[PDB]
Design an enzyme around this catalytic site. Sequence first.
Site, mmCIF file in Angstrom:
data_model
loop_
_atom_site.group_PDB
_atom_site.id
_atom_site.type_symbol
_atom_site.label_atom_id
_atom_site.label_comp_id
_atom_site.label_asym_id
_atom_site.label_seq_id
_atom_site.Cartn_x
_atom_site.Cartn_y
_atom_site.Cartn_z
ATOM 1 C CG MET A 1 -1.999 -1.086 1.225
ATOM 2 S SD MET A 1 -3.070 -1.063 -0.224
ATOM 3 C CE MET A 1 -3.514 -2.802 -0.380
ATOM 4 C CG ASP A 2 0.978 5.066 1.183
ATOM 5 O OD1 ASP A 2 -0.129 5.471 0.775
ATOM 6 O OD2 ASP A 2 1.407 5.283 2.336
ATOM 7 C CG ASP A 3 1.424 4.518 -4.947
ATOM 8 O OD1 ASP A 3 0.218 4.214 -4.988
ATOM 9 O OD2 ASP A 3 1.827 5.693 -4.847
ATOM 10 C CB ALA A 4 4.647 -0.670 -1.392
ATOM 11 N NE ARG B 1 -1.140 6.690 -8.021
ATOM 12 C CZ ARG B 1 -1.119 7.036 -6.745
ATOM 13 N NH1 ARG B 1 -2.252 7.214 -6.068
ATOM 14 N NH2 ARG B 1 0.030 7.205 -6.109
#
Lengths: 44, 47, 47, 98, 69, 41, 304, 103, 49, 244, 45, 344, 24
Positions: free
Chosen positions: L38-41, L212
């Site tokens: 999460m947070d794009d990880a 996105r």
Amino acid sequence: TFIRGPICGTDNCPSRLWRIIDGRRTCQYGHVMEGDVEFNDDED
Amino acid sequence: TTCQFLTKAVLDNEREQLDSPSARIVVGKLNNVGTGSFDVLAKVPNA
Amino acid sequence: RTADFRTLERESRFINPPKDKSAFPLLQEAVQPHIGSFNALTEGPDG
Amino acid sequence: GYVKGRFYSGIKPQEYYFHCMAGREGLIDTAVKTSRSGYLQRCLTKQLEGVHVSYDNSIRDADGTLVQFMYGGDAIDITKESHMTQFEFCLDNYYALL
Amino acid sequence: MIVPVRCFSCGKVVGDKWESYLNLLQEDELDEGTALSRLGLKRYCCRRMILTHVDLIEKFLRYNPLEKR
Amino acid sequence: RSLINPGEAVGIIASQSVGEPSTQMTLNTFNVTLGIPRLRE
Amino acid sequence: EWNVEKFKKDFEVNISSLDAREANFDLINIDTSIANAFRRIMISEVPSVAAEYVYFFNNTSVIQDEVLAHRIGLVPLKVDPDMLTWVDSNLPDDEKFTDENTIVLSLNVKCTRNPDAPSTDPKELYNNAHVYARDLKFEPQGRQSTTFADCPVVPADPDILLAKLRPGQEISLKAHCILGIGGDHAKFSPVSTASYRLLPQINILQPIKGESARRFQKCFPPGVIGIDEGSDEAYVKDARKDTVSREVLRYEEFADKVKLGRVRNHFIFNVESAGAMTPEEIFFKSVRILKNKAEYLKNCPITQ
Amino acid sequence: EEPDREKIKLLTQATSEDGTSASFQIVEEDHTLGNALRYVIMKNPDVEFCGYSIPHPSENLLNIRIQTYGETTAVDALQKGLKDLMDLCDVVESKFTEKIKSM
Amino acid sequence: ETNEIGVPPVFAVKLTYPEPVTAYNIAELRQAVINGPDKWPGATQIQNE
Amino acid sequence: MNRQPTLHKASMMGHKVRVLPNEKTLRLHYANTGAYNADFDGDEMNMHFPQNENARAEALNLANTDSQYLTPTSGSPVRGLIQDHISAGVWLTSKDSFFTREQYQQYIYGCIRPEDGHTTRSKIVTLPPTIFKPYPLWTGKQIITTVLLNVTPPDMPGINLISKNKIKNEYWGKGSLENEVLFKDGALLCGILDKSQYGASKYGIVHSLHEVYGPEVAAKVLSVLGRLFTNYITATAFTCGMDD
Amino acid sequence: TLKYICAECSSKLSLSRTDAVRCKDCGHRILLKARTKRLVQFEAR
Amino acid sequence: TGQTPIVKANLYDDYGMDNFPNGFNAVVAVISYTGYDMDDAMIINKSADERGFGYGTMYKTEKVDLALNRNRGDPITQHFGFGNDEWPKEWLEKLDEDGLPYIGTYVEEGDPICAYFDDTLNKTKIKTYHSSEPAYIEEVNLIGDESNKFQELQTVSIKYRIRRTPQIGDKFSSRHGQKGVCSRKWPTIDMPFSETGIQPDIIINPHAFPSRMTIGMFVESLAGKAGALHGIAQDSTPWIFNEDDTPADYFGEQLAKAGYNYHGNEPMYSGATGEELRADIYVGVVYYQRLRHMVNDKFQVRSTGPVNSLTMQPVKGRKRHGGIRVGEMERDALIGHGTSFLLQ
Amino acid sequence: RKDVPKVEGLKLEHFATGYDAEDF
Ligand SMILES: [Zn+2]
Ligand SMILES: [Zn+2]
Ligand SMILES: [Zn+2]
């Protein structure tokens, strides 16, 4: 790895040095040399 | 403009009392805000 | 089909390099205004 | 600039050239956003720098000089005044909040 | 660089079926849908690897300084 | 019980309630000097 | 109360197709946490032999050091376990690798300029240009010769290319087999993929006779549904034949006439193999690692 | 002669005095035998509570926690489960050896 | 936990706390000198009077 | 801990160190990254290990994270779960959550551990199921009833809360009442849990545990919730296809 | 026998000290050292 | 070992970027499964990277110049190689007799890189590999001189091979803008396993799409499996599909005839529990790009060390035990917490 | 606008695990 240079305190012997943590230099047995200054400079 | 004030403060003969946090840090004094506004004293049981 | 990877034409090009003509000609056309502007210092009408 | 196309089926080459125009105004914004707000936070904290609530609840600058006589009048901790006026809720939970 | 030895997902051995794969294309003129299939590749994790492989080792072997010219 | 606990840094928080959310307002107008160059005067 | 001798009366096994590289077998009425635990061993905890240590002597070729060191380690060496023992690598090299833990391999390949007449093929233009992984030679160290008279070390997949060489280049290295398991490194995996799937169950709800029966084949893989007439309107031949497609749940006429869903207690284990060991015996290296992962708890002192 | 007293490690600060609510911390474990044992413990009708946990998946940790109703300590319900986790493998092998040999 | 941070063993063998010795910490500070800066529950350097 | 742009002072908090083996980077929880405002694009955050005991008490009592729950700007919360669990929580609190017996302790014990010492009663206590005669099944709203029972002190009685959502009522069928999140006696009796419950949202249930039960109980609930749906996501996950 | 490789013509020169830095067949001032037989080990993944 | 994109344009081959491959093919399950992403990880597979998965390397060369000190009429003073009036051992284990190292010898910091024995001090003063990463020597080049034909070398170039596997933190990206760091090398046994055994290689976050709008990745994943099974390599030039010719309807006739689900979904199971998941998992093959800048040259640690003279304060420098700076707005947040012993 | 060409001659390319190509 040790240099030709000074003798210092801590009462081991007339001793020699080499840097371990790059400026708090020690003797053979890791005793802290009291108060070095470690001249450097930053580039840009 | 550091030395602009330092011009006038030596012209002031300023007995600076070191009570602002931008001055207690200069001398490294304990800052007077929060856990440093008040002293803590030990009451020993014996005379 | 739609389009293709060329899995015998690449192996024939990797092993046997083109002796005759530079394949993929658009790539030499991309960099061409640099070369073409430097060819025109010594070559062309009036030299 | 009115684009009828959805990003499930995709957009036409004219309207894709317009949707790329609103990108580069959303990206000249970020390159001018960052440099503004820094000479204001540090600018306040060289006068609001030793201002604190003394034990007699007044607002004194640390050099003794006084500004306010309570913290904003009512002198309430802002991280505490959440259920301070939630009067319906405090009634609902008297036996656990007492 | 050369064909990978095992598939990056499953764990089946892949590297012995690359030069044995171009010998269903340069010779028999097969389509990749049978050429990959006749070898034994039947999971698409290990069937986007013999299909897709670039094999740039050949463009390295032309640069050898252990040989005259 | 929800009073201010004295010796509170209400000088810092008076700035970091102003200098913190002013990192979020330099965008385009929805006549009046707006946003940060308003606040700088 | 749930007796474990009622479990024996509700546990069947249908071995469908048993080959020396894959086995497709069934587990009737066992749990998704017991049958997971079998599958949890067969990837990782089963012991399998590979090579951690690649002692280069000489290699000047294009494929560099650590890369060809890597791709030797990924080769499944056809070495039966229980004919090596475990290394004890808490002590240095002098007794770390024995003649009893380690199988020792060597590679010696030199490429030369071969003169030949014609675009020219690289196998005829050079002598030993392509380092195949059937060039790995077992050095019998120690006493590994009185009992390897019917199990010599051969790699299980011999035609693996390892490197391509040009004249001047050579590869001289020494390889050491280590006995390992697939938690540490992937290369000790004893399997291609030991996964299961679970038996689907297709329930017709409204009878779909006639034209609704003939268009009903094309939603599914073919050998599943059997339609004849009004009588014998449809049935299911074998849903094991049917992978889960859910094509029929795209059609609006059929999106309320049928039920797709698994039978929750019929595990179709299809275990393949990389090549080191047979699948129908590495499953016995998971029905007896579980049984000897409980004894390490049970016959063990409950501390404090 | 060597006991390996570090496998079945019983934490005590979450343990009942009577032993009907015990607390482990098993190393060299993860979800492998964590859920294979939790299924078999919960078949014992005396067991009132049995979950298996992992505090952090990186190292080998398996905190499981048996709690019972009465007349059986939680460790005495552990060792019925590990007895009935072994006897399962008695059933599976001699119903999978009996089918390889049956073709 | 939400009031926490995860720390690697790279950080965990460099940062030191000057812990004074008493009669209640001596059960731990003796094991700190046995380990040294090799195993993690340890100590780097000591300080006499 | 320290982000390099420190605008609000809650970018500078304190953390109990858990030293994790087998790692080379810092490890942060999602509750933190709503406060520091640092997404996981790989930001260089500093770290400062204090050196005496007048400071270690300050890092545990003044500038710790749990006391920095509300912003000191306008009193809004800055902690909270952020992306995974919020959209995950509207599935466990949904009406179709029908856990069986063995799962029910497992979802409880997977988020609550007396061994590590999360509870107060020193023994995990369970509830009666919500179905009795055919086959005994538990419910996910009753899981949130259990994880409020077991990290809150027994001396105080249960909670009572009225709250809304961002789900409008008609998404569940014929005008059903899953917008009105109604807590009574420490139970999730009606309503689904959303960002308005346990995000950085004001007057939610995690902000109605901050004020009733004090700061160090609600900030212990998010460590249980942050273990609750993570063991639920791992047993049943949440994709996003093309047909959506 | 200790030698080198020439850059241009691949002539395995063997250099002693106080020699010209050229190659013996082509006067090419750029010359790359080769490897001997030495023992080095590695891991794998 | 890079591959080429299955999903590409046809203005790709006409530039011929198969002569420069850049990136690889990952089996991608769009799923939130771990909680570590999460947070794009994102979550690499373990046994993918242990089989090499963007196994990158790096190079760097270094000038070794004695003539940078040497003046014009300065004689040729110091010379590569050892000398006499000495015998320090273990330099012979890193270096060769000319004082230039064996190619392919594992060096570190503290290790000799060349032996130049001068004649004004009569001692071999070696220099040392001036970095902190486990390197090698790739090739050494003995560089001649220009203004003469005959004098000894005072310039060497030495090429290093730093190996760089994908550790945790090493950034990825697909071709659409979906970058995100490698959060956790999850073991492959506890990743989701599909109907056949097809386990994903990078798990990517579905809570990274709706803010996105990168839906070209939502179709490349169903196009990628459409090229992978059938053995074609579909064109993805912009503006080939009109609004009447939906690509999810175009790539859906392919997957319907293949046997997989029409919508690109695949029913996975759970790798940690054993039961099946509820949803059908969107699985495909996308094209990922392992980025340049990594975290393996970012972090540092400092407890104690080099003070200065003018300040008696610590030193900057990532190659020099760099000291963390507590700065201006770091000073004025410790005051704002009220603490004055976390500031003292 | 000529459509994106429906490529001709595609077959079933995934089957049951243990049932390869008996389907015709
Ligand atoms: Zn002395
Ligand atoms: Zn595969
Ligand atoms: Zn030459």
